Design a binder for this molecule. Structure first.
Ligand SMILES: Nc1ncnc2c1ncn2[C@@H]1O[C@H](COP(=O)(O)OP(=O)(O)OP(=O)(O)O)[C@@H](O)[C@H]1O
Ligand SMILES: Nc1ncnc2c1ncn2[C@@H]1O[C@H](COP(=O)(O)OP(=O)(O)OP(=O)(O)O)[C@@H](O)[C@H]1O
Ligand SMILES: Nc1ncnc2c1ncn2[C@@H]1O[C@H](COP(=O)(O)OP(=O)(O)O)[C@@H](O)[C@H]1O
Ligand SMILES: [Mg+2]
Ligand SMILES: [Mg+2]
Lengths: 466, 482, 187, 499
């Protein structure tokens, strides 16, 4: 069945079919274009007319142009041959290495795993970062979110997480670059080629790349995350493997939905967002889950517009995450990198039964002293430090030392600050923070804990400025 | 083709299917699509019917035959649903087989009137020292567990679920509380973890988990609270006591907003429909305490509201606060300061109050409440007898209120602990060791002095002999421990 | 765009645009009367069980309806511009409003030939001599080389007086005269 | 009703006179207003195709409705009336491109506004081409010297990078761009052919007098001969301001795709965002935060992403972008500023507090970063700038002990060193020597108010007699041990002579 284009408004194209209306979420190929413009059916407007969302630019589309129905949703090449290859929204290899010769194809749109297929196993994914490991530890096979504003450290943190886990990860990995800088994608591709995680010679590559960037039209940016998720789903289900799914940035999916919903003819929700803001987000997110077949340990970077965590897009996504890491611009202003907020990042495995009694006690003590310092900050700000009690002064000093000690250099950030990246183990940072809380290091200066790893580095830095 | 008992889809988009025909379809009547998907006719427009689809709309296309069912949307109800995890429409999703319910009940039934109700008398024990002491919850009352994300609302709900086990496996029929949990907007992983927790505590055998997750369509998430409300109403009208938890009504409001906006209904404040207040009011008003003329049953409600950055003055939180009888304010500042559960007893209130509370607990809780109020008056920043003693006593009581997760306490044990704290048996110990002392005292009393706890539980109040014996044992244990 | 001849009434609405366009087109080529006759006879061929159905049916293609109507209007002797009007209505989907367009054009042509009825509503009709007397006095009111139509109504609520709407004037000497007694009641 | 359900179109249909008019290639305006003109006809028109009106204005077919076409007019809508005939041009909206535009002040559509004659362009490039993908790009390697000591030292800008110049009103945002334009003259005059940088300046919404004075400044500095000035001022219609960045972006893409290096200055991208917000609101699209459309981020992303560095497979060209964002009361955490920050590869904050105190340029070195800038920095400049950055950071950390007193003194000396005059960009080796003087502790003795005088004299001394050392530094690209010794000797000698 072939239809004719009737309306071309932005990325939304309306097609009228003489017979055989394609169902919703069905790919339609536009005939007469040098490239491959494929439309995804979104609505049946009646009068044998469908409304579609284009996966590419709609320039040059003429009303009445012939478009052929594919008869199936957008399908992508999936399998072991996708490892070490770059794909776009519609599964076209954009790494100019030839076609992706996979034996099977998978539909972009699928149903989330059922309730019984869900898994409840919870472990700890030690990432080598003091703030993450101590306060908000990550769980293997659990959704992880990296909240933050503009230029606070989301990309650097996700690259550090990749460098720490994926290289040492036994299973495969999938990276889905949604609405991010294309030069960042090129840098990641070349870094993975150099590190050997992607090999251009033999089939030993471990990570598959999917890239729909900010240059893409809103239709493409709203489905590339689904492409990466589909690849991860295949690797999880049909092979029973442990897979890491890195998404950056996942907010652009919601932003693309908001861009297309204005043209789709929907009454806008709060802050001009689409009314179907939570439904589509839930449909996309609940597919990124650890079933009984396999585990998807997903790390997702979530952009926070105008540094407003109450914005609907970064607010509705909290319920979809096990471990939450909320970066803050105010902390980054103080030079504490990473900019993780210790009083806003939370984890689900932060429980004495799972993480251990000592770990939970240390984390809770650190959070308590930080909250006490933050409560005292107003009096310190107005009156001065000299007006506090001796115990209050001690708490302020210890909390400032803890804030300095949370900062940690990153290997990916070595080219930036010149400080060698440090990968502390869980026990070492636990011991260091326990010692700081106890008071063994109440004589060292505050700067002795800045941009250091283990507490031994702090004590070996304190005596340098003797 | 018939156009009175059936019709065709004019246009299907975003889960809304305009239908031509259905001239005899009723308002809010459940309709059935060709592909097997079910619907609900909300907009009866002059030339079309706006049907919300209970599921994915990819299987619905223009020209499909829509058929009536002849009955307003209703949910399978009964006691067979105990131990079963169902969806908004009542279908079993735990793979345990079909539900054997023999009766059905509408999801939009009217709330009981003035006459059928009676005063809230029986206490609703939650197992939380703070709730059972300073913010008591009666049976038939509706308390709002309000707070921000990751503050402990679901923890309070599940602890209340677990605490009922002691009554449910007991003998008397007047203390059994058949819990119901409604999951709105949560991901399936969280619901699976919750049901695993319930099974681990053996709380599933008397609870019903109605889940309308985020992947489920907006109509399902909008209908889920009413389904659980009907399931609770079944117990309420048959002389049995039930507990219903809506977690959380904010996501139900979001789902209803999506449904209304997709139905071309005009937006209101914060894009929400005009009748968001009605949406919850017609739901929470169905939580009542029937008198003896109607079986004497009850339905305690525990709605949960998520507030952004503690903005309790927002639209939906204010509506739900105005609807409910009491609020349990959970504050992140108290959460991080080590106070867990982070129940802000300063603002947390209970309209029923002392009306539904055991006598001994009330007797000791009056003193505890007065002392904590004075401490809060003198908390922030030098009479050792007046201020410093009061400050120390308040710190001891605050450390007493702290309780671990998934460990609800028996009411008599709570009474004993609060008595120990109130009568100056912990002022000598360090504040840090209070929790350790409480655990050890719990073990000792539950081991050796079970007779005293049985006497307290049976009497319902602490008498002179009981008070003297409790003083004796607490003094002996204080001497032994320190 | 060439200027179009404005009809005298200038009715408004969805049928208004079509009626105005038809009046302007038929005023050109001087085919107002033929178009009016074809409209008054096309309404009857638009109410058959087969014709009334399949055009209110939304699940039949507009192309099918356009042809079903093109061949119908061709075999119905219609070969001027009214066939074009029917085709345009079928293409634009305003077929259900076609009776309204016909009524609007009929009212326009009526005002072009006749006048607004002088509605009289007092009570049960009086003698025919009074009827012809009031018809003659209404004609004298008009007296502009035109002939007006008449519409007599009955109203028990209206007392011994009568209310006459000669065009758009609507004089009133009726039960409202007893209402004007409030002036005595007031002061 | 619908737009084409008007009585005139219905009369044309029923009368049968729908045969003479060419509805396939031409169209008539149904309703002109709010900057969007609805056109009946143009059945063969394309999406984004440029259509020209009867009056002479050109428009872009944005919305292709089933019965009409929504055309945005690139000009004043007063000149467009109902019934005007609109005819296709058979081309997606494009702009004249090539080296023939070097030295020409053009508007958004490429029409010359300097009165120097018609543009002799031979090729036209679409204004909405997609940005290059992952494969065609390579990492930023070549430096892009701006001539500003603070920029070229602490916030280096690569060739192909996107560096945001963000600040408040009257903070020197335009001055940095102008100095960068002038600084490239030394490379363009020579025959390097790989260090040449053909600059482009796009004015979006700013005053016509300001643009004319900028053109005068460039001409007086003999910098117009290698730059293109695309002007869409305040008087120009909102569509012109919306389109102006893309026209200059295409002009730079021409150089990028032919193995040449170009620089594009999107002055006041915030004003382009305001113009696009106006266009969207007049189109009755749902506004979001700050009444902005939901696709402003896409509006800026599809523009800045085109600026990139191509690998040797695609000619090895580049296109450096330096957008300018105006912030209100220094609100970095605002919708448009945060959108642009999420796109660019860095930022240069120009605090109004520093500008008021006399620190010109007002770069906030604490908050100004350049992600890919370290790779695209010369070795000698890197050698001095690493130490300079470390010392400045330590100064910021402490701002009575002898050590902290010395640290504060060195920080003050470096801060006074970073002060630079206007319209006088410095050569890379000269900046290297100047920073070397301060870093190696040859200014701690001087009074802070005399540092600028010392630099003014030292530049003249070195550039006059010690030209050989500067040439050696420029050729080597690094400060060798022999170079280090010679520079140390000469700076000590001049310090002794300065007194
Ligand atoms: N009483 C408690 N003692 C200790 N930790 C607790 C307690 N209550 C909750 N927590 C902690 O809070 C976290 C989970 O809180 P919970 O899910 O109850 O909160 P919530 O506000 O309902 O969250 P959400 O918005 O994610 O549903 C875990 O880290 C758990 O350890
Ligand atoms: N390096 C400098 N040294 C001294 N004065 C300077 C310097 N740079 C800019 N100025 C002064 O700043 C003023 C205007 O600066 P400029 O136009 O570059 O700033 P701007 O913030 O981009 O402006 P606008 O928002 O008005 O376009 C002039 O008075 C100019 O002399
Ligand atoms: N761990 C870190 N150490 C030092 N600097 C950092 C760190 N993380 C981020 N940054 C700073 O942030 C910038 C990159 O931020 P990015 O990760 O791109 O944030 P976003 O992805 O939100 O734009 C770099 O220029 C760097 O200076
Ligand atoms: Mg980023
Ligand atoms: Mg919860």
């Amino acid at each position: 069945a072939t239809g004719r284009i009737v309306a071309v408004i932005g990325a939304v194209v309306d097609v009228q079919f003489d017979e055989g209306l394609p169902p919703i979420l069905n790919a339609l190929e536009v005939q007469g274009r040098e490239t491959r413009l494929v439309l995804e059916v979104a609505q049946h407007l009646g009068e044998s007319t469908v409304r579609t969302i284009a996966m590419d630019g709609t320039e040059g589309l003429v009303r009445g142009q012939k478009v052929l129905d594919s008869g199936a949703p957008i399908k992508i090449p999936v399998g072991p041959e996708t490892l070490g290859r770059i794909m776009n929204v519609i599964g076209e290899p954009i790494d100019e290495r030839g076609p992706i010769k996979t034996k099977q194809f998978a539909a972009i749109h699928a149903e989330a795993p059922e309730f019984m297929e869900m898994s409840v196993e919870q472990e700890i994914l030690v990432t080598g970062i003091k703030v993450v490991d101590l306060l908000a530890p990550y769980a293997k096979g659990g959704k992880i979110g990296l909240f933050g504003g503009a230029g606070v450290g989301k990309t650097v943190l996700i690259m550090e997480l990749i460098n720490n886990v994926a290289k040492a990860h036994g299973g495969y990995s999938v990276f889905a670059g949604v609405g991010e800088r294309t030069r960042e994608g090129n840098d990641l591709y070349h870094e993975m080629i150099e590190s050997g995680v992607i090999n251009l010679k033999d089939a030993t590559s471990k990570v598959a790349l999917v890239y729909g960037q900010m240059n893409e039209p809103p239709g493409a940016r709203a489905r590339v995350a689904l492409t990466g998720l589909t690849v991860a789903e295949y690797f999880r289900d049909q092979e029973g493997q442990d897979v890491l799914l890195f998404i950056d940035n996942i907010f652009r999916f919601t932003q693309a939905g908001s861009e297309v919903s204005a043209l789709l003819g929907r009454i806008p929700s709060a802050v001009g967002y689409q009314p179907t803001l939570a439904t589509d987000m839930g449909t996309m997110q609940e597919r990124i889950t650890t079933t009984k077949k396999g585990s998807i340990t997903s790390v997702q970077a979530i952009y926070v517009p105008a540094d407003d965590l109450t914005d609907p897009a970064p607010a509705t996504t909290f319920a979809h995450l096990d471990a939450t890491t909320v970066l803050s611009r105010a902390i980054a202003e103080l030079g504490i990198y990473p900019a993780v907020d210790p009083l806003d990042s939370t984890s689900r495995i932060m429980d004495p039964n799972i993480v251990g009694s000592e770990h939970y006690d240390v984390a809770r003590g650190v959070q308590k002293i930080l909250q006490d310092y933050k409560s005292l900050q107003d009096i310190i700000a107005i009156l001065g430090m000299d007006e506090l009690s001796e115990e209050d002064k001690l708490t302020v000093s210890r909390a400032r030392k803890i804030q300095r000690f949370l900062s940690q250099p990153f290997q990916v950030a070595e080219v930036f600050t010149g400080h060698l990246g440090k990968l502390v183990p869980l026990k070492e940072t636990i011991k260091g923070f326990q010692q700081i809380l106890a008071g063994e290091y109440d004589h060292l200066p505050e700067q002795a804990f800045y941009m250091v790893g283990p507490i031994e580095e702090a004590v070996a830095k304190a005596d340098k400025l003797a | 083709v018939d156009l009175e008992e059936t019709g065709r889809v004019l246009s299907i988009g975003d889960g809304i299917a305009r239908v031509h025909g259905l001239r005899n379809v009723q308002a809010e009547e459940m309709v059935e699509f060709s592909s097997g998907l079910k619907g609900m006719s909300l907009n009866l427009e002059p030339d079309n019917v706006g049907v919300v689809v209970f599921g994915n709309d990819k299987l619905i296309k223009e020209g499909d035959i829509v058929k009536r069912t002849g009955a307003i949307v209703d949910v399978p109800v009964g006691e067979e649903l105990l131990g079963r995890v169902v969806d908004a429409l009542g279908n079993a999703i735990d793979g345990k087989g079909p539900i054997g319910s023999k009766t059905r009940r509408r999801v939009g039934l009217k709330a009981p009137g003035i006459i059928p109700r009676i005063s809230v008398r029986e206490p609703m024990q939650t197992g939380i020292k703070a709730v059972d002491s300073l913010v008591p919850i009666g049976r038939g009352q509706r308390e709002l567990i309000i707070g921000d994300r990751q503050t402990g609302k679901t923890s309070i709900a599940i602890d209340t679920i677990i605490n009922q086990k002691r009554f449910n496996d007991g003998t008397d029929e007047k203390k059994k509380l058949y819990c119901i949990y409604v999951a709105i907007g949560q991901k399936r992983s969280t619901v699976a973890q919750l049901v695993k927790r319930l099974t681990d505590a053996d709380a599933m055998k008397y609870t019903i988990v109605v889940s309308a997750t985020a992947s489920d369509a907006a109509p399902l998430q909008y209908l889920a609270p009413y389904s659980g409300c009907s399931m609770g109403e079944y117990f309420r009208d048959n002389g049995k006591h039930a507990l219903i938890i809506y977690d959380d009504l904010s996501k139900q409001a979001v789902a209803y907003r999506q449904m209304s906006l997709l139905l071309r209904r005009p937006p209101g404040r914060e894009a929400y429909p005009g009748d968001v207040f009605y949406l919850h009011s017609r739901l929470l008003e169905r939580a009542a305490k029937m008198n003896d003329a109607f079986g004497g049953g009850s339905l305690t409600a525990l709605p949960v509201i998520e507030t952004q950055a503690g903005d309790v003055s927002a639209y939906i939180p204010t509506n739900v606060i105005s609807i409910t009888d009491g609020q349990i304010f959970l504050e992140t500042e108290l959460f991080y300061k080590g106070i867990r559960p982070a129940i802000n007893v300063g603002l947390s209130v209970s309209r029923v109050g002392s009306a539904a509370q055991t006598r001994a607990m009330k007797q000791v809780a009056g003193t505890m409440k007065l002392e904590l109020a004075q401490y809060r008056e003198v908390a922030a920043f030098d009479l050792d007898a007046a201020t410093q003693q009061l400050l120390s006593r308040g710190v001891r009581l605050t450390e007493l209120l702290k309780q671990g997760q998934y460990a609800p306490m028996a009411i008599e044990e709570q009474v004993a602990v609060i008595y120990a704290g109130v009568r100056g048996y912990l002022d000598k110990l360090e504040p840090s060791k209070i929790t350790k002392f409480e655990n050890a005292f719990l073990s000792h009393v539950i081991s050796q002095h079970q007779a005293l706890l049985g006497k307290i539980r049976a009497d319902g109040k602490i008498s002179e002999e009981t008070d003297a014996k409790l003083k004796e044992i607490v003094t002996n244990f204080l001497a032994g421990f320190e | 765009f060439a200027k179009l001849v404005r009809p005298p009434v200038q009715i408004y609405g969805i049928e208004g645009r079509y009626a105005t366009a038809l009046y302007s087109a038929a005023s050109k080529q001087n085919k107002l009367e033929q178009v009016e006759k074809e409209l008054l006879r096309v309404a009857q061929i638009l109410k058959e069980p087969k014709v009334a159905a399949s055009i209110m049916n939304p699940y039949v293609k507009r192309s099918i309806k356009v042809k079903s109507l093109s061949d119908m209007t061709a075999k119905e002797k219609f070969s001027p511009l009214t066939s074009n009007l029917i085709n345009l209505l079928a293409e634009n989907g305003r077929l259900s409003s076609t009776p309204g367009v016909i009524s609007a054009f009929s009212t326009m042509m009526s005002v072009h030939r006749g006048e607004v009825p002088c509605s009289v509503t007092t009570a049960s009709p009086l003698d025919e001599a009074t009827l012809t007397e009031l018809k003659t006095v209404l004609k004298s009111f008009l007296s502009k080389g035109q002939i007006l139509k008449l519409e007599v109504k009955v109203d028990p609520s209206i007392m011994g007086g009568m209310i006459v709407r000669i065009g758009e004037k609507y004089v009133d000497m009726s039960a409202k005269t007893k209402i004007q007694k409030l002036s005595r009641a007031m002061r």
